């Protein structure tokens, strides 16, 4: 609130970057280890048990 | 016997309304090359959920309307010497499938490969003598696409 | 040869009335299903406490007999190939009981799997309608000895 | 007798798949059991709106393109004595469709009940267990033709 | 004779009900009549757009390259004598393809005309009166013409 007080436009852009950072980088994170967790549970899914 | 196993529980594909290759349900699941794409001629198995694998080159499934129905039980022991297969007798030649030219065609893919009990341990997805580019199973079970070198799809 | 495995080996339960579940003693365990209830027929094993073991549905307790306690010995090996049941014969492929699908009906849950030794290795809790060849959800005693409850992707409480 | 008569008129309905039961088409009535629906494995008739009467279980629709050759007749009179069906008799105890345990399954509802002389009497849209023979679920005409579903107390769809 | 040549080559198409017309795959194009309407079976040679021609009344598309032997061959070189038919025999007299009594009926239109060696020399499209006659045939240097007599009612 103190710097929105101070300079409104540029701490609004500046949180608008953190939520859109921290947005991106999860589901980048998420998406890799979900691509990850697919590469490696394919062969125990086409050849069962063993 | 081959013949016999596979026919009515190894389903052909309708690319354009010809056949380009059988898709198969092996273990209670479904499977079949991804770089044919068509349609599965049977109804109650063509609407099932299906999620790829472009590192092996295989869609895989399962079968819905029963858990187990066409059995096609597999094998992961590749006995080198004599082995045979639905067109001609595939030789498991020092580490290596191998076929005469003169058999074969265009729509090859997605062939199951049996054995002496019936059970199929690998399936041609490509490829005188010629060598053919097939997903086989390992001791460990690794899901492995071995391809010798240059390879064409059939 | 099977029949007489089971004579008065496997004493069933009354539903007050006819017959549900098929409760049996191996090893001085009276094991009999949850999911089943009733009345047991005889008398003799009537009159004892039975603890319960819910996720296995299993009501196991003491055999009521003194001294010489005609139970059924098991054995926990499993070759595939050759397993009789008292309904006919029962495939065990890659860890996996099957009947074909005409018979196995409601209410015969509890008669125990036998093989050529007449070893018990398995109890019928369920199962799954699995096309022609049905899948029966069991209780099975792996190579360490652990009592593990397996069924299909399907569940029909037979 | 009653194959050759049923046949090539008694057209099923399909779900999805296999088969769970049989669409009648008597007289200009396309009539099908509403507890499980499906589409018409037949051309001409698939495409015909059918309009519901959920009271009896019904939905009645015309076929004005087959002249006649489609339809059987159908007649109010009802001794007690025997009858065809696909699993036999339904022997009339007291004004009952009655048929024994050892026949009789699910998914095959909708099937005509013909005489001896091969007309449709009863259209059987289900059934229940209790006593020595299994009791249907029918639509029947009394004996003034006023079309009557009779449902034997606590009953089930087959 | 004429059923082994026209075996499965005579798609027939349904007016979401009874058999309403025919359709001929020859020369490589699917030719069928606009005064029929519906849908022809084998879906697989049912997926080709359709070109009109309401002059000559025939939709006109591309077969799908399963042609091979399954086209049927036209000829323009046409004797005249004896032709076959589903139906039986049809004669030529001076530019008229003629059937005796009413064995022509509705829903029998786009049925082709064979000849002896086995080659489409006409496709009915109708006809009028002791004898039967609209038929699409083929002229001397080859140009489609459409021979209807007068009062030719369609199947």
């Given at each position: 609130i103190h710097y929105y007080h101070r300079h409104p436009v540029y701490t609004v852009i500046v949180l608008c970057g953190v939520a859109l950072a921290i947005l991106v980088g999860t589901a980048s994170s998420a998406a890799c280890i979900a691509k990850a967790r697919r590469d490696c549970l394919t062969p125990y899914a086409l050849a069962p048990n063993a | 016997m081959c013949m016999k196993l596979e026919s009515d529980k190894t389903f052909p594909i309708m690319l354009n309304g010809q056949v380009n290759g059988y898709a198969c349900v092996v273990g209670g699941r479904l499977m079949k090359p991804l770089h044919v794409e068509g349609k599965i001629?049977?109804?109650?198995?063509?609407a099932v959920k299906l999620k790829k694998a472009s590192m092996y080159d295989l869609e895989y499934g399962d079968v819905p309307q029963?858990?187990?129905?066409d059995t096609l039980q597999y094998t992961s022991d590749k006995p080198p010497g004599f082995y045979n297969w639905h067109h001609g007798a595939v030789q498991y030649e020092n580490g290596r499938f191998t076929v005469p030219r003169g058999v074969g065609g265009k729509?090859?893919?997605?062939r199951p490969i049996l054995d002496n009990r019936g059970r199929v341990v690998a399936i041609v997805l490509g490829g005188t003598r010629t060598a053919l580019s097939v997903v086989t199973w390992n001791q460990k079970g690794v899901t492995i696409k071995d391809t010798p070198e240059g390879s064409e799809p059939w």
């Open positions: - | 001629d049977n109804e109650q198995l063509a029963n858990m187990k129905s729509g090859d893919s997605g």
